[PDB]
Amino acid sequence: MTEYKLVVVGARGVGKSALTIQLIQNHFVSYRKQVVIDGETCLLDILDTAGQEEYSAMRDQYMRTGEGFLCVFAINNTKSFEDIHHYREQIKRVKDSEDVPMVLVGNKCDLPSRTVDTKQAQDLARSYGIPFIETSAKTRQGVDDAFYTLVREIRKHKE
Amino acid sequence: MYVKLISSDGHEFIVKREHALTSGTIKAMLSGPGTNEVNFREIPSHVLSKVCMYFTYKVRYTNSSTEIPEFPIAPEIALELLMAANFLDC
Amino acid sequence: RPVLRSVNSREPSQVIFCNRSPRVVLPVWLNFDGEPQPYPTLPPGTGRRIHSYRGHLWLFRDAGTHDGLLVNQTELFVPSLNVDGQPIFANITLPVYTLKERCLQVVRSLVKPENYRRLDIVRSLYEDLEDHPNVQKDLERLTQERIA
Amino acid sequence: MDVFLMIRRHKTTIFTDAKESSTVFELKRIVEGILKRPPDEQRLYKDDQLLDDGKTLGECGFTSQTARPQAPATVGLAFRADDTFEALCIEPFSSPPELPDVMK
Numbered sequence: 001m002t003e004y005k006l007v008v009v010g011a012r013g014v015g016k017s018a019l020t021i022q023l024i025q026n027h028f029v030s031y032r033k034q035v036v037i038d039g040e041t042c043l044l045d046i047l048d049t050a051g052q053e054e055y056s057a058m059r060d061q062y063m064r065t066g067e068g069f070l071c072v073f074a075i076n077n078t079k080s081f082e083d084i085h086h087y088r089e090q091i092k093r094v095k096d097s098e099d100v101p102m103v104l105v106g107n108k109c110d111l112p113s114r115t116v117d118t119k120q121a122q123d124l125a126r127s128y129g130i131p132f133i134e135t136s137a138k139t140r141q142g143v144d145d146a147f148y149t150l151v152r153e154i155r156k157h158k159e
Numbered sequence: 160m161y162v163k164l165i166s167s168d169g170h171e172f173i174v175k176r177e178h179a180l181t182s183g184t185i186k187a188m189l190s191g192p193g194t195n196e197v198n199f200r201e202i203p204s205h206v207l208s209k210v211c212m213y214f215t216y217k218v219r220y221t222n223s224s225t226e227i228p229e230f231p232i233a234p235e236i237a238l239e240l241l242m243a244a245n246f247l248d249c
Numbered sequence: 250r251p252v253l254r255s256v257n258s259r260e261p262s263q264v265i266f267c268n269r270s271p272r273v274v275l276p277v278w279l280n281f282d283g284e285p286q287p288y289p290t291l292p293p294g295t296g297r298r299i300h301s302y303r304g305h306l307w308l309f310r311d312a313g314t315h316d317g318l319l320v321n322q323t324e325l326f327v328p329s330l331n332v333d334g335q336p337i338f339a340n341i342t343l344p345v346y347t348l349k350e351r352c353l354q355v356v357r358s359l360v361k362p363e364n365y366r367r368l369d370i371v372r373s374l375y376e377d378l379e380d381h382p383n384v385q386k387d388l389e390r391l392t393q394e395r396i397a
Numbered sequence: 398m399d400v401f402l403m404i405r406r407h408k409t410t411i412f413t414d415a416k417e418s419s420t421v422f423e424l425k426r427i428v429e430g431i432l433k434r435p436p437d438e439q440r441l442y443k444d445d446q447l448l449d450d451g452k453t454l455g456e457c458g459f460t461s462q463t464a465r466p467q468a469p470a471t472v473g474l475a476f477r478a479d480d481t482f483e484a485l486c487i488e489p490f491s492s493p494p495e496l497p498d499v500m501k
């Protein structure tokens with residue numbers, strides 16, 4: 001059985017931890033789960049949900065082992081969406097490649113204070129060549145699709 | 160103003176004087192602190208020609224600002240041109 | 250602190266790395282300690298919108314042979330700050346190598362380092378072949394050249 | 398746009414340059430300033446075909462992509478001793494030795 005190491009990334013408070021907790025235990029307030037995605041049973045292992053900033057050679061060596069990345073921003077926060085570029089570029093640096101499995105994730109679509117329009121993110125995702133999924137850690141909406149899509153983008157990257 | 164560079168097998172090469180001076184050796188044999196042609200007894204014509212091509216290459220693409228191409232060196236001429244370049248100080 | 254080091258300006262500057270050389274280019278960033286740090290390779294003819302910072306020092310080498318290259322016709326590249334958000338352009342080009350150094354490159358690529366001493370060349374060219382391009386050697390040279 | 402040329406007659410080879418827009422007659426003028434022969438007594442050739450004195454260098458095939466400085470285009474040269482015209486002959490350069498086994 002193949003194992004897919006995923007890293008959840010984003011600005012502070014975008015809901016990285018909430019999404020992963022919602023993914024595993026189906027609950028909203030070690031990250032491993034066996035799942036069947038496109039007929040191939042695999043094991044998802046979330047590597048990090050902490051948004052603190054640390055450019056240590058050890059964390060680089062830790063992020064370098066991750067196979068997929070969920071770039072998460074909150075649509076209630078404009079700067080979380082603007083920083084997506086920086087998180088994406090840091091992934092390119094540690095992976096030492098321009099094409100790395102990635103998925104842009106917009107969290108907190110249940111909140112009524114949207115400041116980042118959906119049209120903006122799909123345009124940004126279309127420029128990045130990666131899928132874009134709107135998610136809600138409170139309502140389970142899109143959580144499964146967002147991680148499985150990243151697993152799909154990891155299988156796509158292995159030629 | 161031009162200068163003649165004579166190879167080992169008698170091939171004559173008229174090249175612009177400013178282009179020939181790119182090599183420290185030729186520069187020293189013509190313009191010392193105080194001379195129209197120089198004979199190279201151990202450089203065959205198929206090497207001295209490539210050296211002159213390097214001269215015009217060096218002169219033209221030095222002042223270039225946007226993009227410089229590679230200077231190609233065929234494998235069969237590589238050693239004979241390496242000896243010359245080391246000898247000519249260019 | 251060394252002189253060939255980046256500055257912690259923390260002011261981002263979008264830059265375009267443009268490989269106009271026939272080589273696969275290795276972008277080298279000199280960190281705040283002057284230590285050469287490697288960055289993803291640029292195939293020949295490639296351009297990437299890069300995210301750097303003001304005052305950060307860069308140089309570029311052939312990813313395979315570490316041959317020296319030029320960026321905007323200088324050995325080193327420091328991005329200014331983006332005026333009105335427009336990117337700064339980095340134009341990586343080949344140098345006008347010496348005919349000797351270019352000859353060294355061509356034979357290094359054709360002969361494995363073990364067979365260097367199996368050629369009809371002078372002994373002086375043996376050590377010149379073995380003196381492969383090294384980033385640390387060039388940094389010591391470019392530091393001593395900044396004695397202005 | 399410049400073009401870089403190797404004017405060759407017998408065992409003599411001239412490395413000079415000119416613009417794509419320049420004509421063959423202007424090239425013949427530069428050969429007169431070097432070899433001291435009147436352009437009327439000059440005949441310039443691309444490979445084997447004679448070049449028209451009125452046609453520009455680019456019109457003859459000497460583009461910047463074919464007459465590069467690191468790989469110039471070759472132009473033949475033949476003189477005219479009074480009313481006697483010589484035959485175009487360019488003595489070829491030497492040959493390199495077979496590449497050593499250490500490089501194969």
Ligand SMILES: Cc1ncsc1-c1ccc(CNC(=O)[C@@H]2C[C@@H](O)CN2C(=O)[C@@H](c2cc(OCCCCN3CCCN(c4nccc(-c5noc([C@@]6(C)CCCc7sc(N)c(C#N)c76)n5)n4)[C@@H](C)C3)no2)C(C)C)cc1
Nearest residue numbers: 052053054055063083086089090091093288289301302305
């Ligand atoms: C493709 C390509 N082809 C040829 S070249 C190339 C290429 C590829 C990538 C790049 C990326 N660019 C650089 O490497 C540039 C170039 C040179 O200038 C040095 N440099 C730098 O970044 C250096 C630097 C930073 C600096 O100030 C920094 C000032 C930033 C100030 N902050 C504060 C506001 C919030 N916020 C932030 N808050 C919290 C967390 C994060 C974060 N961010 O990521 C990550 C994650 C968790 C996610 C991704 C994977 C990894 S791994 C690792 N350790 C990670 C971490 N902690 C991560 N969390 N962010 C940023 C948006 C802005 N001064 O130097 C670094 C390396 C120390 C450049 C070129």
Ligand SMILES: Nc1nc2c(ncn2[C@@H]2O[C@H](COP(=O)(O)OP(=O)(O)CP(=O)(O)O)[C@@H](O)[C@H]2O)c(=O)[nH]1
Nearest residue numbers: 012013014015016017018049050051108136137138
């Ligand atoms: N309404 C709502 N709140 C959400 C959603 N996702 C996350 N949140 C809230 O956002 C806050 C931060 O999310 P959380 O996952 O805990 O943190 P994080 O993004 O990992 C923060 P750090 O980057 O510091 O690790 C929490 O209060 C959480 O309840 C969502 O879909 N809807």
Ligand SMILES: [Mg+2]
Nearest residue numbers: 017049050051
């Ligand atoms: Mg967290």
